[PDB]
């Protein structure tokens, strides 16, 4: 039964291979396709790429960051609304990074946990990310990522659609990410993590990047690591970095992308 | 080079044989599976099911009625917003079926138009539909589907998220009816259609439907149809079900599911 990282590696080599020439919003070069999907299984095993060195210790921490809903730089420098603003106060009107946002907006991610447990079995179980940029830009900007959930027999699914993904450093971080994000949840909610499964649209690889991405290629992914929740943990805002240890993680060496 | 089609019979397969129990809203039974996605060429030819007669007449004049932004079933009877109204005044507040909209809310369909005409690059061509039901459930209430187009080499793609597809009676009329949609634009835009991707969440096949699409995969399918539009049209609105033809369609017989 093979690898999941055997599908990144693919995608990869698909994009190599089939790519098209496509430039960013800055008129940076790109080889993409558009329309993909893989599938990790999150059961027994966490899917943290081992064909790189993947940075776990920034995947914890950024995600924690997103969840205590802060916009102030400083805790990870006043950014305005970000991942954690939208995830905890969507809606509610931004001032300072300091002020005080009890009760104003949705908590997307709350509403999440208290659907999963009070109705498993809703299809509407959905959260979204925005690009902080788009947010002046225009009237109901579209979303950059919408995460579904999915509860069947004590398991919980997660579904990550981006409308982009830069394949050689946004993804495997991405996919760590979400995967955390899914074992959070399924911690509090007494389930079992069942499955990631990662969905893009434009799937892209910048220029400067396919020559460490074909080097990476040759590389024969390891066993996937385990996570460990140390800790019995009740509420989303209690997880702290140290109630998280990864287990048996052993990739190949570093590799930079800029 | 396998037909299209052949990936819908295995996804049907597949849900059959892996398929999980999970009850809908009602508490009716469906075999499910989270995640999916296939892919149609839209290149010299038409994704209209073979393995059983599409109702095409019906896929043709749902679509135009949407594009009108229509709330009056009797058009296809004051329905509330419907997949026209968000398609064409998304937020604007609601009356009846007879009122007077022009200028009123985000007209998503005109903004797709206009961005891949002002900026094919972007990565943010994006259009919303919410199942009516949801918009007085809730405060930002998630859509029930997605769809992003992508521009290169002058092809236009087209991705469709759906967080939930009923496999046996939704799917079908789907693919033909986002695959209409991207000739439609890709027409008025000067470009080729290029690929339909199809994406799901809970992707799910009704308990009634089991026996019916069991016979369904006997069938072998046959080339899919072309389409052709027999006028030069020139705003999404001019289009009339008269401007469309499809040829050489030659499906298995009607299977009605309820």
């Given at each position: 039964p093979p690898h999941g990282e055997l599908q990144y590696l693919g995608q990869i080599q698909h994009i190599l291979r089939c790519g098209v020439r496509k430039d960013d919003r800055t008129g940076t070069g790109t080889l993409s396709v558009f329309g993909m999907q893989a599938?990790?299984?999150?059961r027994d095993e966490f899917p943290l790429l081992?064909?790189?060195?993947?940075?776990?210790?920034?995947?914890?921490?950024?995600?924690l960051w997103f969840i205590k809903g802060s916009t102030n730089a400083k805790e990870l420098g006043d950014?305005?609304?970000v991942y954690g603003f939208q995830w905890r106060h969507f809606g509610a009107e931004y001032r300072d990074m300091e002020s005080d946002y009890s009760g104003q907006g949705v908590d997307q991610l709350?509403?999440?946990i208290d659907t999963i447990k009070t109705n498993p079995d809703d299809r509407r179980i959905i959260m979204?990310?925005?690009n902080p940029r788009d947010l002046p830009l225009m009237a109901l900007p579209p979303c950059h990522a919408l995460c579904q959930?999915?509860?069947?027999?004590?398991?919980?699914?997660?579904?990550?659609?981006?409308?982009?993904g830069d394949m050689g450093l946004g993804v495997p971080f991405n996919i760590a990410s979400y995967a955390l994000l899914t074992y959070?949840?399924?911690?509090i909610t007494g389930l079992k993590p069942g499955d990631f499964i990662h969905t893009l649209?434009?799937?892209?690889?910048?220029?400067?990047?396919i020559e460490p991405l074909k080097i990476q290629l040759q590389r024969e992914p390891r066993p996937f690591p385990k996570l460990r929740i140390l800790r019995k943990v009740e509420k989303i805002d209690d997880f702290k970095a140290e109630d998280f240890q990864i287990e048996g993680y052993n990739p190949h060496p570093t590799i930079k992308m800029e």
């Open positions: 599938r990790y299984s999150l081992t064909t790189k060195r993947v940075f776990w210790k920034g995947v914890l921490e950024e995600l950014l305005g609304p709350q509403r999440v979204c990310a925005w959930f999915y509860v069947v027999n004590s398991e919980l699914s997660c579904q990550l659609y981006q409308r982009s959070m949840i399924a911690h649209g434009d799937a892209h690889i910048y220029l400067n990047h």
